Amino acid sequence: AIYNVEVETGDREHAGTDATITIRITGAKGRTDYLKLDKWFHNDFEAGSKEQYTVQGFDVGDIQLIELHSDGGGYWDPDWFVNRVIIISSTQDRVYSFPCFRWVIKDMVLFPGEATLPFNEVPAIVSEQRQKELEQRKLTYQWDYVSDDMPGNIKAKTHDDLPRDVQFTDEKSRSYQESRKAALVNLGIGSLFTMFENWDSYDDYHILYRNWILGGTPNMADRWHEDRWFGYQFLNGANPVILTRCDALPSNFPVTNEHVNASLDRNLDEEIKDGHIYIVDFKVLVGAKSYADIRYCAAPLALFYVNKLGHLMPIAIQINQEPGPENPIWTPHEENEHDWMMAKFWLGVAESNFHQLNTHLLRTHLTTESFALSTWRNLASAHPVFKLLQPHIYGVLAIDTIGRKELIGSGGIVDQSLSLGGGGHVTFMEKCFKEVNLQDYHLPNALKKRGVDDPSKLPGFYYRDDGLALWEAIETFIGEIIAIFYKNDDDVKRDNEIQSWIYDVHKNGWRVNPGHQDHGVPASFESREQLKEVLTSLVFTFSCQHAAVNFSQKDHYGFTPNAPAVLRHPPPKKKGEATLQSILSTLPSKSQAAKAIATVYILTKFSEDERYLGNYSATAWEDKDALDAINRFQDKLEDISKKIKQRNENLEVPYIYLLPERIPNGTAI
Ligand SMILES: [Ca+2]
Ligand SMILES: [Ca+2]
Ligand SMILES: [Ca+2]
Ligand SMILES: [Fe+2]
Numbered sequence: 001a002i003y004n005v006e007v008e009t010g011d012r013e014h015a016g017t018d019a020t021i022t023i024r025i026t027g028a029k030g031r032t033d034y035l036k037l038d039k040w041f042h043n044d045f046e047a048g049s050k051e052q053y054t055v056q057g058f059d060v061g062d063i064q065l066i067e068l069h070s071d072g073g074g075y076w077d078p079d080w081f082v083n084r085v086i087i088i089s090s091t092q093d094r095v096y097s098f099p100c101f102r103w104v105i106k107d108m109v110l111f112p113g114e115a116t117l118p119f120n121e122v123p124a125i126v127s128e129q130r131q132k133e134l135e136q137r138k139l140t141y142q143w144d145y146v147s148d149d150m151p152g153n154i155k156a157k158t159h160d161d162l163p164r165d166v167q168f169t170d171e172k173s174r175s176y177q178e179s180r181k182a183a184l185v186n187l188g189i190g191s192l193f194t195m196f197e198n199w200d201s202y203d204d205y206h207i208l209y210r211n212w213i214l215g216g217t218p219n220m221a222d223r224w225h226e227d228r229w230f231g232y233q234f235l236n237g238a239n240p241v242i243l244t245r246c247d248a249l250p251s252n253f254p255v256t257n258e259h260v261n262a263s264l265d266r267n268l269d270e271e272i273k274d275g276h277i278y279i280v281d282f283k284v285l286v287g288a289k290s291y292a293d294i295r296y297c298a299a300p301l302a303l304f305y306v307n308k309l310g311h312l313m314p315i316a317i318q319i320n321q322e323p324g325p326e327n328p329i330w331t332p333h334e335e336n337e338h339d340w341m342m343a344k345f346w347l348g349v350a351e352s353n354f355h356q357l358n359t360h361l362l363r364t365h366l367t368t369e370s371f372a373l374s375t376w377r378n379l380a381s382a383h384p385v386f387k388l389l390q391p392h393i394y395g396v397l398a399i400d401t402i403g404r405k406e407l408i409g410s411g412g413i414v415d416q417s418l419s420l421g422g423g424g425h426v427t428f429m430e431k432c433f434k435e436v437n438l439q440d441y442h443l444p445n446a447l448k449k450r451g452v453d454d455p456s457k458l459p460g461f462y463y464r465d466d467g468l469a470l471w472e473a474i475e476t477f478i479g480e481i482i483a484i485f486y487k488n489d490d491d492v493k494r495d496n497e498i499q500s501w502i503y504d505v506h507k508n509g510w511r512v513n514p515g516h517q518d519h520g521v522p523a524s525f526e527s528r529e530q531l532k533e534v535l536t537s538l539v540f541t542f543s544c545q546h547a548a549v550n551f552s553q554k555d556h557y558g559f560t561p562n563a564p565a566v567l568r569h570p571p572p573k574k575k576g577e578a579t580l581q582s583i584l585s586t587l588p589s590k591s592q593a594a595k596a597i598a599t600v601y602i603l604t605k606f607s608e609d610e611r612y613l614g615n616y617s618a619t620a621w622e623d624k625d626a627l628d629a630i631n632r633f634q635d636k637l638e639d640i641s642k643k644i645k646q647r648n649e650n651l652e653v654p655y656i657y658l659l660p661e662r663i664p665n666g667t668a669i
Contacts, residue, residue, distance in 0.1 A: 003025060011047060023069070025087065031060055068107065101619070130382055168395075179601070192590045202584075220563075236462050236655050291421045301318050384626075441540070467548065475536045
């Protein structure tokens with residue numbers, strides 16, 4: 001009898017309703033009857049309201065769960081986004097919290113505070129009510145596949161076709177669209193599009209980014225031409241992947257001491273084997289270019305060497321896999337300057353497509369999408385991990401939906417930007433995926449398994465430093481939570497839910513279809529340290545990974561000559577033919593280069609309603625310990641944030657892509 005119901009409404013556009021809301025409290029001695037919550041001569045549940053409704057009914061025992069019920073809205077978006085509900089029984093000395101943060105269509109059952117594992121002590125009704133929702137989730141979130149060689153994704157024709165809980169905030173859409181090719185016009189590039197001519201000089205390209213006032217001028221926009229900075233980027237550029245330490249030269253990359261020598265402080269075979277030689281091998285390329293707009297791309301491999309002064313230097317570039325008089329080994333000593341510059345460019349077009357399609361779209365978006373769908377399908381609003389993932393899985397589902405049309409679809413801004421845009425990009429994506437493995441998403445392992453792990457040999461690798469820093473915090477945090485709710489490795493095995501989660505991804509997420517090699521995803525969890533491992537990788541990829549590989553694009557591609565996406569001619573068959581003209585009639589044309597900035601501009605736009613790593617402002621989480629763990633976590637993030645800046649306050653080109661307050665909680669683009 002007599003309950004105080006504090007009903008805070010989210011501030012999301014539309015978060016409010018004008019539907020007749022009634023609540024039904026249920027508990028020990030029983031349940032009441034839907035009580036109308038509504039202040040007179042007052043507009044209840046608006047914009048981002050927070051109201052205290054006093055109502056009176058049967059005396060439900062200890063309140064075991066509540067039920068909010070709406071009704072089509074009012075005459076003059078009856079979808080209500082409830083943030084939280086906090087009721088108080090005038091007969092119970094507790095303060096029932098009911099974190100929600102979801103849209104309330106017709107109904108919405110909410111369990112009290114503390115997050116629980118499906119097996120924890122739950123009154124009969126609170127389960128069956130939980131198992132209840134799960135049957136519903138596996139109904140409004142079902143798999144669909146585009147092909148046998150792509151991770152499964154959420155079924156939904158259009159963005160607005162998928163569940164409102166996963167849809168883009170009006171702001172995300174507004175930001176998306178405004179930023180869309182609408183923002184192409186504000187860049188002052190519009191004309192270049194209808195311009196299929198060449199450029200007069202490297203420096204000419206510079207225009208494409210003048211009216212892109214934000215973020216500032218691209219880093220490499222004034223050092224791109226320099227070998228030293230050309231190498232720098234393989235460590236701190238947008239593709240911090242690929243580069244692996246070279247223990248021995250690949251049999252088809254006949255680099256000899258008689259090739260490099262010149263660029264060696266301190267021998268070659270001695271250098272290799274002394275940890276001062278790293279290599280990049282784009283063998284995965286072999287796709288279809290073009291889209292007479294004829295495009296090109298290679299599958300080269302380059303050799304780098306760490307200077308007497310820690311600079312990773314480009315010493316050898318074989319444009320294509322099969323060595324030969326036709327695919328020569330280009331050195332930074334090519335007596336014909338242009339020929340070496342042309343080599344680097346080719347290495348560039350390759351990286352560009354490799355990076356955009358593979359290490360960004362597939363490896364951060366598309367693949368981890370599966371996990372996020374598994375999250376809604378298998379974990380319940382109550383499960384600790386659902387509450388842990390929620391703030392990180394947002395935006396993938398939405399942006400990927402949009403993306404399959406707008407991004408990688410035909411005539412999509414990407415499609416008509418890379419040299420694999422004809423559709424070769426779709427097939428190439430499949431190749432890359434047939435080889436993705438969950439063990440790749442583990443930064444520490446990955447880094448280490450590449451021989452890129454050591455500071456003394458490979459100095460100046462901030463992606464690594466900054467990455468590991470964040471990973472160790474993310475890992476730490478995730479850990480403690482698992483601890484809180486998972487008392488031991490048995491609770492893990494016991495958790496039927498987390499078992500279904502990781503399994504949905506195993507058998508339907510990254511399907512190990514024919515060609516594919518095992519995708520390294522478990523089929524169940526055996527320990528806590530393992531659950532921790534997967535979870536950490538997953539969130540680190542949703543946040544840190546994505547940011548360091550995507551948001552670094554304005555700088556990277558900023559001045560297209562620094563990272564060409566398309567090449568209009570075949571690669572040098574002989575040597576010494578490269579002309580400023582030639583290598584300028586090969587680089588992306590005026591409109592092509594315009595299509596780049598355009599794509600990149602849209603790809604790298606933060607919305608106003610963004611939340612970063614720390615932020616959990618709109619998460620369930622009631623348990624005191626968790627909250628602490630969180631703040632503990634946020635405290636480490638701060639440190640990293642400071643320490644990182646000190647680092648930058650001290651180097652020629654500051655690595656700011658992994659700064660906590662720039663790393664979105666998830667992947668929304
Ligand atoms: Ca509404
Ligand atoms: Ca209202
Ligand atoms: Ca009213
Ligand atoms: Fe993205």
